[PDB]
Short mmCIF file of C-alpha atoms and ligand atoms in Angstrom, two decimals:
data_model
loop_
_atom_site.label_atom_id
_atom_site.label_comp_id
_atom_site.label_asym_id
_atom_site.label_seq_id
_atom_site.Cartn_x
_atom_site.Cartn_y
_atom_site.Cartn_z
CA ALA A 1 -27.48 -31.47 10.07
CA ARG A 2 -24.17 -29.89 9.00
CA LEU A 3 -21.05 -31.97 8.24
CA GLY A 4 -20.76 -32.35 4.45
CA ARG A 5 -21.52 -28.68 3.77
CA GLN A 6 -19.32 -27.79 6.77
CA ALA A 7 -16.20 -28.72 4.76
CA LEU A 8 -17.18 -26.04 2.22
CA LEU A 9 -18.85 -23.36 4.37
CA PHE A 10 -15.91 -22.93 6.77
CA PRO A 11 -13.33 -21.94 4.09
CA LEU A 12 -16.01 -19.91 2.24
CA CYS A 13 -16.82 -17.71 5.24
CA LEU A 14 -13.14 -17.20 6.06
CA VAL A 15 -12.70 -16.11 2.43
CA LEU A 16 -15.77 -13.86 2.81
CA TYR A 17 -14.12 -12.36 5.90
CA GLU A 18 -10.78 -12.05 4.06
CA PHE A 19 -12.60 -10.34 1.17
CA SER A 20 -14.42 -7.80 3.37
CA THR A 21 -11.28 -6.90 5.35
CA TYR A 22 -9.58 -6.38 1.97
CA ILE A 23 -12.26 -4.18 0.32
CA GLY A 24 -12.41 -2.60 3.79
CA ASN A 25 -9.26 -0.95 2.47
CA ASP A 26 -9.71 -1.07 -1.32
CA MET A 27 -13.26 0.37 -1.47
CA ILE A 28 -12.35 3.01 1.11
CA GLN A 29 -9.45 4.73 -0.70
CA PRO A 30 -11.57 6.12 -3.57
CA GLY A 31 -14.31 7.09 -1.08
CA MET A 32 -11.61 8.76 1.01
CA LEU A 33 -11.99 11.98 -1.02
CA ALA A 34 -15.59 12.19 0.21
CA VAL A 35 -14.42 11.51 3.79
CA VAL A 36 -11.74 14.23 3.68
CA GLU A 37 -14.22 16.73 2.22
CA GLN A 38 -16.90 15.87 4.81
CA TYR A 39 -14.49 16.32 7.73
CA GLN A 40 -12.68 19.19 5.95
CA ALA A 41 -9.36 17.46 6.55
CA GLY A 42 -6.97 17.94 3.62
CA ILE A 43 -5.82 15.38 1.03
CA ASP A 44 -2.73 14.39 3.07
CA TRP A 45 -5.12 12.32 5.23
CA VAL A 46 -6.14 10.20 2.20
CA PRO A 47 -3.12 7.83 2.14
CA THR A 48 -2.94 7.87 5.96
CA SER A 49 -6.21 5.89 6.04
CA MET A 50 -4.35 2.98 4.46
CA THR A 51 -1.22 3.64 6.54
CA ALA A 52 -3.25 3.25 9.74
CA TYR A 53 -5.23 0.27 8.38
CA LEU A 54 -2.01 -1.58 7.53
CA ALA A 55 -0.40 -0.46 10.82
CA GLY A 56 -3.24 -2.24 12.63
CA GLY A 57 -2.71 -5.22 10.33
CA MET A 58 0.74 -5.86 11.84
CA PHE A 59 -0.24 -5.16 15.46
CA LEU A 60 -1.25 -8.62 16.76
CA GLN A 61 0.01 -11.47 14.46
CA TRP A 62 2.76 -12.42 16.92
CA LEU A 63 0.24 -12.89 19.75
CA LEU A 64 -2.92 -14.22 18.08
CA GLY A 65 -1.40 -17.43 16.67
CA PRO A 66 0.02 -18.90 19.91
CA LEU A 67 -2.86 -17.34 21.93
CA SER A 68 -5.55 -19.07 19.84
CA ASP A 69 -3.39 -22.18 20.14
CA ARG A 70 -3.82 -21.89 23.94
CA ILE A 71 -7.44 -20.70 24.28
CA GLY A 72 -9.10 -21.87 21.03
CA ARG A 73 -9.11 -21.06 17.30
CA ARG A 74 -12.91 -20.59 17.36
CA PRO A 75 -13.32 -18.01 20.18
CA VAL A 76 -10.28 -16.00 18.97
CA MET A 77 -11.34 -15.98 15.30
CA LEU A 78 -14.96 -15.09 16.14
CA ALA A 79 -13.69 -12.25 18.36
CA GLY A 80 -11.77 -10.84 15.38
CA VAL A 81 -14.90 -10.93 13.24
CA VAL A 82 -16.97 -9.20 15.96
CA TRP A 83 -14.18 -6.61 16.41
CA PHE A 84 -14.20 -5.77 12.68
CA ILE A 85 -18.01 -5.42 12.73
CA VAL A 86 -18.00 -3.22 15.87
CA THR A 87 -15.08 -1.04 14.70
CA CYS A 88 -16.67 -0.70 11.23
CA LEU A 89 -19.84 0.63 12.88
CA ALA A 90 -17.95 2.76 15.42
CA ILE A 91 -16.27 4.82 12.65
CA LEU A 92 -19.64 6.43 11.79
CA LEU A 93 -19.42 8.25 15.15
CA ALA A 94 -15.98 9.76 14.44
CA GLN A 95 -16.00 13.54 14.85
CA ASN A 96 -12.70 14.41 13.17
CA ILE A 97 -10.22 12.80 10.77
CA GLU A 98 -7.92 11.85 13.68
CA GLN A 99 -10.67 9.72 15.25
CA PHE A 100 -11.52 8.32 11.80
CA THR A 101 -7.84 7.44 11.31
CA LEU A 102 -7.63 5.92 14.81
CA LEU A 103 -10.63 3.63 14.22
CA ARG A 104 -9.11 2.94 10.80
CA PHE A 105 -6.15 1.58 12.80
CA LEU A 106 -8.43 -0.44 15.10
CA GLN A 107 -10.25 -1.84 12.04
CA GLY A 108 -6.86 -2.87 10.62
CA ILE A 109 -6.24 -5.31 13.51
CA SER A 110 -8.90 -7.47 11.81
CA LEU A 111 -6.34 -8.51 9.17
CA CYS A 112 -4.15 -10.23 11.79
CA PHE A 113 -6.81 -12.89 12.40
CA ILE A 114 -6.81 -14.07 8.75
CA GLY A 115 -3.40 -15.79 8.54
CA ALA A 116 -2.39 -16.20 12.18
CA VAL A 117 -5.56 -18.06 13.24
CA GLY A 118 -7.93 -18.36 10.24
CA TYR A 119 -5.45 -19.94 7.82
CA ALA A 120 -3.88 -21.90 10.69
CA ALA A 121 -7.25 -23.66 11.03
CA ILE A 122 -7.28 -24.40 7.26
CA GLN A 123 -3.82 -25.95 7.70
CA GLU A 124 -4.92 -27.98 10.74
CA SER A 125 -8.27 -29.07 9.22
CA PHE A 126 -7.83 -30.09 5.57
CA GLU A 127 -5.65 -32.53 3.62
CA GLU A 128 -2.61 -31.07 1.83
CA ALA A 129 -4.39 -31.46 -1.54
CA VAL A 130 -7.56 -29.62 -0.43
CA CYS A 131 -5.51 -27.05 1.53
CA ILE A 132 -3.77 -26.03 -1.72
CA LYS A 133 -7.16 -25.44 -3.37
CA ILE A 134 -8.32 -23.23 -0.47
CA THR A 135 -5.02 -21.29 -0.45
CA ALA A 136 -5.46 -20.70 -4.21
CA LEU A 137 -8.97 -19.28 -3.68
CA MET A 138 -7.55 -17.02 -0.95
CA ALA A 139 -4.96 -15.83 -3.47
CA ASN A 140 -7.64 -15.21 -6.13
CA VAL A 141 -9.61 -13.07 -3.67
CA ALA A 142 -6.42 -11.15 -2.84
CA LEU A 143 -6.10 -10.36 -6.57
CA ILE A 144 -9.75 -9.36 -7.17
CA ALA A 145 -10.18 -7.03 -4.14
CA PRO A 146 -7.69 -4.32 -5.25
CA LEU A 147 -9.41 -4.20 -8.68
CA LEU A 148 -13.06 -4.55 -7.66
CA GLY A 149 -12.61 -2.27 -4.61
CA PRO A 150 -11.54 0.95 -6.39
CA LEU A 151 -14.07 0.42 -9.23
CA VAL A 152 -16.99 -0.26 -6.86
CA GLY A 153 -15.79 2.40 -4.38
CA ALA A 154 -15.65 5.13 -7.03
CA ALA A 155 -19.17 4.21 -8.17
CA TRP A 156 -20.42 4.06 -4.56
CA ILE A 157 -19.68 7.69 -3.59
CA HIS A 158 -21.78 9.15 -6.43
CA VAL A 159 -24.99 7.54 -5.16
CA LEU A 160 -24.37 6.47 -1.56
CA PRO A 161 -22.51 7.92 1.48
CA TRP A 162 -19.12 6.62 2.65
CA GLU A 163 -20.83 5.58 5.91
CA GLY A 164 -22.83 3.02 3.90
CA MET A 165 -19.58 1.33 2.85
CA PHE A 166 -18.77 0.50 6.48
CA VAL A 167 -22.32 -0.79 6.93
CA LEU A 168 -21.67 -3.07 3.92
CA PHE A 169 -18.34 -4.25 5.39
CA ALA A 170 -20.02 -5.04 8.73
CA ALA A 171 -22.90 -6.84 6.98
CA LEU A 172 -20.63 -9.07 4.86
CA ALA A 173 -18.59 -9.75 8.01
CA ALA A 174 -21.82 -10.45 9.94
CA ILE A 175 -22.76 -13.06 7.32
CA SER A 176 -19.29 -14.60 7.70
CA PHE A 177 -19.67 -14.57 11.51
CA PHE A 178 -22.80 -16.75 11.47
CA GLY A 179 -21.22 -19.03 8.85
CA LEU A 180 -18.01 -19.53 10.84
CA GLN A 181 -19.97 -19.94 14.11
CA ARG A 182 -21.72 -23.01 12.70
CA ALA A 183 -18.95 -24.47 10.51
CA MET A 184 -15.51 -23.74 12.03
CA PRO A 185 -13.84 -26.67 13.83
CA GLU A 186 -11.76 -26.27 16.98
CA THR A 187 -8.24 -27.28 15.93
CA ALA A 188 -6.09 -25.71 18.67
CA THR A 189 -3.65 -28.38 19.88
CA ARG A 190 -2.47 -26.59 23.04
CA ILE A 191 -5.73 -25.72 24.85
CA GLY A 192 -4.99 -25.15 28.55
CA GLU A 193 -1.25 -24.48 28.28
CA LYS A 194 0.33 -21.31 29.68
CA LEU A 195 1.61 -18.59 27.32
CA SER A 196 5.00 -16.98 27.97
CA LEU A 197 5.69 -13.60 26.33
CA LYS A 198 9.35 -13.75 27.39
CA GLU A 199 9.65 -17.13 25.66
CA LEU A 200 7.82 -15.81 22.56
CA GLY A 201 10.11 -12.76 22.43
CA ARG A 202 13.05 -15.16 22.14
CA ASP A 203 11.38 -16.81 19.13
CA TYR A 204 11.16 -13.51 17.26
CA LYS A 205 14.71 -12.60 18.31
CA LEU A 206 15.92 -15.85 16.69
CA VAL A 207 14.17 -15.30 13.32
CA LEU A 208 15.51 -11.72 13.06
CA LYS A 209 19.01 -13.17 13.58
CA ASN A 210 18.47 -15.26 10.43
CA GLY A 211 20.19 -13.08 7.83
CA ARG A 212 18.78 -14.82 4.76
CA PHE A 213 15.20 -14.68 6.08
CA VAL A 214 15.28 -10.94 6.93
CA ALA A 215 16.72 -10.15 3.46
CA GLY A 216 13.83 -11.93 1.70
CA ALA A 217 11.16 -10.48 4.01
CA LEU A 218 12.27 -6.85 3.50
CA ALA A 219 12.52 -7.48 -0.27
CA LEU A 220 8.81 -8.50 -0.37
CA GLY A 221 8.04 -5.23 1.42
CA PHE A 222 10.20 -3.06 -0.85
CA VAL A 223 8.96 -4.65 -4.08
CA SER A 224 5.23 -4.33 -3.34
CA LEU A 225 5.51 -0.77 -2.01
CA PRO A 226 5.03 0.86 -5.45
CA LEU A 227 1.79 -1.11 -5.91
CA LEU A 228 0.65 -0.28 -2.36
CA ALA A 229 1.67 3.38 -2.78
CA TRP A 230 -0.39 3.57 -5.97
CA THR A 231 -3.44 2.07 -4.21
CA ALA A 232 -3.04 4.63 -1.41
CA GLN A 233 -2.48 7.70 -3.58
CA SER A 234 -4.11 7.12 -6.99
CA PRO A 235 -7.27 8.95 -5.81
CA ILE A 236 -5.18 12.06 -5.04
CA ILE A 237 -2.83 11.67 -8.04
CA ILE A 238 -5.59 11.25 -10.67
CA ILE A 239 -8.59 13.19 -9.35
CA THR A 240 -7.11 16.05 -7.28
CA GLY A 241 -3.63 15.92 -8.86
CA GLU A 242 -4.34 15.45 -12.58
CA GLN A 243 -7.77 17.15 -12.33
CA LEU A 244 -9.45 14.04 -13.79
CA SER A 245 -12.67 12.21 -12.85
CA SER A 246 -13.67 8.90 -11.22
CA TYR A 247 -13.89 7.21 -14.61
CA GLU A 248 -10.20 7.85 -15.40
CA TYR A 249 -9.24 6.91 -11.84
CA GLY A 250 -11.10 3.58 -12.15
CA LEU A 251 -10.02 2.98 -15.76
CA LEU A 252 -6.33 3.28 -14.83
CA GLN A 253 -6.74 0.49 -12.23
CA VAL A 254 -7.61 -1.97 -15.02
CA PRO A 255 -4.24 -2.17 -16.79
CA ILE A 256 -2.31 -2.19 -13.49
CA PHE A 257 -4.28 -4.78 -11.51
CA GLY A 258 -5.12 -6.60 -14.75
CA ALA A 259 -1.37 -6.87 -15.33
CA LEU A 260 -1.00 -8.26 -11.79
CA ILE A 261 -3.55 -11.00 -12.55
CA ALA A 262 -1.85 -11.70 -15.91
CA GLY A 263 1.45 -12.13 -14.05
CA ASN A 264 -0.16 -14.69 -11.72
CA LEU A 265 -1.88 -16.66 -14.49
CA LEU A 266 1.43 -16.98 -16.38
CA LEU A 267 3.17 -18.01 -13.14
CA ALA A 268 0.54 -20.75 -12.79
CA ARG A 269 1.34 -22.05 -16.29
CA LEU A 270 5.14 -21.72 -16.02
CA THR A 271 5.39 -23.19 -12.48
CA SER A 272 5.99 -26.85 -13.44
CA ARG A 273 8.90 -25.95 -15.74
CA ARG A 274 10.58 -23.13 -13.79
CA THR A 275 12.26 -23.05 -10.38
CA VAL A 276 11.27 -20.34 -7.92
CA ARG A 277 14.47 -18.29 -8.38
CA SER A 278 14.33 -18.34 -12.20
CA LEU A 279 10.81 -16.85 -12.00
CA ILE A 280 12.17 -14.13 -9.70
CA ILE A 281 14.85 -13.27 -12.28
CA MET A 282 12.26 -13.62 -15.07
CA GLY A 283 9.81 -11.28 -13.31
CA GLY A 284 12.67 -8.96 -12.30
CA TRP A 285 12.92 -7.63 -15.87
CA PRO A 286 9.34 -6.27 -16.11
CA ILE A 287 9.66 -5.00 -12.49
CA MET A 288 12.80 -2.94 -13.13
CA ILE A 289 11.94 -1.76 -16.65
CA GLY A 290 8.41 -0.88 -15.49
CA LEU A 291 9.53 1.22 -12.52
CA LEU A 292 12.33 2.77 -14.61
CA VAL A 293 9.90 3.78 -17.39
CA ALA A 294 7.45 5.29 -14.87
CA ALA A 295 10.32 7.26 -13.28
CA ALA A 296 12.04 8.45 -16.50
CA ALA A 297 8.66 9.47 -17.98
CA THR A 298 7.42 11.63 -15.09
CA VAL A 299 10.83 13.21 -14.45
CA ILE A 300 11.05 14.54 -18.03
CA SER A 301 7.27 15.13 -18.12
CA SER A 302 5.52 15.61 -14.76
CA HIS A 303 1.95 15.01 -16.01
CA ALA A 304 2.62 11.92 -18.15
CA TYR A 305 0.12 9.80 -16.22
CA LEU A 306 -0.47 7.28 -19.03
CA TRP A 307 3.28 6.54 -19.23
CA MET A 308 3.22 6.21 -15.43
CA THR A 309 0.23 3.84 -15.65
CA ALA A 310 1.98 1.79 -18.36
CA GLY A 311 5.12 1.68 -16.19
CA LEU A 312 3.18 0.44 -13.17
CA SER A 313 1.38 -2.13 -15.34
CA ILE A 314 4.65 -3.63 -16.66
CA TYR A 315 5.92 -3.51 -13.05
CA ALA A 316 2.72 -5.17 -11.75
CA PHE A 317 3.07 -8.01 -14.29
CA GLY A 318 6.54 -8.63 -12.84
CA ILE A 319 5.14 -8.69 -9.27
CA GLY A 320 2.47 -11.28 -10.13
CA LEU A 321 5.15 -13.46 -11.68
CA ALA A 322 7.79 -13.10 -8.93
CA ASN A 323 6.11 -12.54 -5.52
CA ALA A 324 4.49 -15.95 -4.89
CA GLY A 325 7.92 -17.50 -5.47
CA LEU A 326 9.72 -15.08 -3.14
CA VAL A 327 7.07 -15.70 -0.44
CA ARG A 328 7.85 -19.43 -0.73
CA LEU A 329 11.65 -19.01 -0.51
CA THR A 330 11.38 -16.62 2.46
CA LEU A 331 9.16 -19.07 4.37
CA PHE A 332 11.70 -21.87 3.87
CA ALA A 333 14.70 -19.57 4.49
CA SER A 334 14.04 -20.06 8.21
CA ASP A 335 13.79 -23.60 9.59
CA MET A 336 11.49 -22.48 12.42
CA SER A 337 7.78 -22.69 13.36
CA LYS A 338 5.65 -21.72 10.33
CA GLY A 339 3.40 -19.61 12.58
CA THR A 340 6.34 -17.52 13.80
CA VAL A 341 7.90 -17.21 10.31
CA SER A 342 4.62 -16.15 8.64
CA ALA A 343 3.78 -13.63 11.38
CA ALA A 344 7.35 -12.26 11.24
CA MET A 345 7.37 -11.65 7.47
CA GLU A 346 3.78 -10.37 7.47
CA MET A 347 4.80 -7.98 10.26
CA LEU A 348 8.14 -6.99 8.68
CA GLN A 349 6.84 -6.25 5.17
CA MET A 350 3.94 -4.21 6.57
CA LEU A 351 6.41 -2.09 8.53
CA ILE A 352 7.77 -1.19 5.08
CA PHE A 353 4.30 -0.48 3.63
CA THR A 354 3.27 1.81 6.49
CA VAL A 355 6.53 3.79 6.64
CA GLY A 356 6.80 3.68 2.83
CA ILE A 357 3.33 5.05 2.05
CA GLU A 358 4.08 7.97 4.40
CA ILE A 359 7.42 8.77 2.69
CA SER A 360 5.65 8.17 -0.64
CA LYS A 361 2.98 10.71 0.30
CA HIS A 362 5.55 13.38 1.20
CA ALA A 363 7.42 12.59 -2.03
CA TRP A 364 4.25 13.36 -4.04
CA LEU A 365 3.21 16.43 -2.01
CA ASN A 366 6.69 17.99 -2.34
CA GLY A 367 7.58 16.81 -5.86
CA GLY A 368 4.52 15.35 -7.61
CA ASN A 369 4.53 12.33 -9.95
CA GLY A 370 8.28 12.45 -10.65
CA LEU A 371 9.27 12.12 -7.01
CA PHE A 372 6.45 9.63 -6.36
CA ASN A 373 7.81 7.34 -9.11
CA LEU A 374 11.52 7.92 -8.27
CA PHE A 375 10.84 6.75 -4.72
CA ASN A 376 9.18 3.63 -6.17
CA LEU A 377 12.28 3.07 -8.33
CA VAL A 378 14.53 3.17 -5.22
CA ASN A 379 12.29 0.49 -3.69
CA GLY A 380 12.70 -1.71 -6.77
CA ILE A 381 16.47 -1.18 -6.64
CA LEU A 382 16.46 -2.12 -2.93
CA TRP A 383 14.54 -5.30 -3.79
CA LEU A 384 17.06 -6.02 -6.56
CA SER A 385 20.01 -5.27 -4.26
CA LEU A 386 18.60 -7.82 -1.81
CA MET A 387 17.98 -10.38 -4.58
CA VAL A 388 21.63 -10.60 -5.69
CA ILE A 389 22.54 -11.55 -2.09
CA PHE A 390 19.41 -13.66 -1.42
CA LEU A 391 19.85 -15.63 -4.67
CA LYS A 392 23.59 -15.53 -5.43
C1 KHJ B 1 -3.29 -7.65 4.50
N1 KHJ B 1 -2.52 -7.68 3.26
C2 KHJ B 1 -3.09 -8.17 2.14
C3 KHJ B 1 -2.38 -8.21 0.94
C4 KHJ B 1 -1.06 -7.75 0.90
C5 KHJ B 1 -0.34 -7.79 -0.29
C6 KHJ B 1 0.98 -7.34 -0.37
C7 KHJ B 1 1.65 -7.41 -1.59
N2 KHJ B 1 1.04 -7.90 -2.69
C8 KHJ B 1 1.76 -7.96 -3.96
C9 KHJ B 1 -0.22 -8.34 -2.64
C10 KHJ B 1 -0.94 -8.30 -1.45
C11 KHJ B 1 -0.50 -7.25 2.07
C12 KHJ B 1 -1.25 -7.23 3.25
PR1 PR B 2 11.84 -22.05 23.59
PR1 PR B 3 8.43 -21.62 20.91
#
């Protein structure tokens, strides 16, 4: 007898899935030093784990939304959960870092199911008032994962093997599979209809023609790249770069991702009395000053990692205050299907993350902290350059 508890279990398991796909990245980065050392791979493969994971995350959004609309939101979502489980277990059999990285890419495809079909079902199932509550919980999980992940991941690889992490990801996903199997409704409104890739290609051609949309989408990518670059490389900057331990590594996540949360909590308070664009200008100050301080500090003094951390913290506060607003404006910058717009901007900004982490990596390998931070400053400037057009 499940109908009252169904209204709560369905969003909970999707959030559990969202959480485990997220720590599936955030727990793995600290443990990536163990992985590299166990394959004898070289530290340059540490950020590439995330690069491949995110590259998979942009692989199928365009398809999965309209496909699940045609064949069912249940069978497509459940397939994504199974896929994550199977690919999480398959990585234990990887014989080199290339195979590890390749499965890391296959595991990344699991992210595409969250918004394009999972959240689509939340939109199609719940009232606007309840939908807001669920979206908020999804946002709170997206804030906790990149703080919990590195802390728990650093602690994990001093007692347990990295393999065990993937067992944990598959287990949490397995729990969410059984929960979704019982509780998820079937809310696809086009079951039976034919899907036309040629027609769908025209939809994505039309959104890319929208100048104001593309400007906002790229800006979201550019502005979050410093934060994503830090997540990817902080294990190699702090531990192998600065010759520090796991404690320092983990400790330095607190002011940065704490600052992110602080930026979101203030946004929540200030939202009723500030327009979206004023919050973008408001948050722009800590973003620019933060990135500028981190750059200036590590150019004049290469090993000033506390000044770098403080710079990223001030920057992160700006991101928490500005991003949610810019996401909103970008969505409504294109008067086209919300499924296509969301998939487009999710896809576009992740193109920037994947390429950006790779350039970021080479910046640090060839120039250390100074060139790592300077590249992050360029990204801020590119976000700011786009904002003066996008806003004025
Ligand atoms: C799959 N995925 C999750 C979270 C982000 C994300 C990007 C930028 N920020 C600021 C937060 C979260 C991107 C992709
Ligand atoms: Pr058409
Ligand atoms: Pr269409």
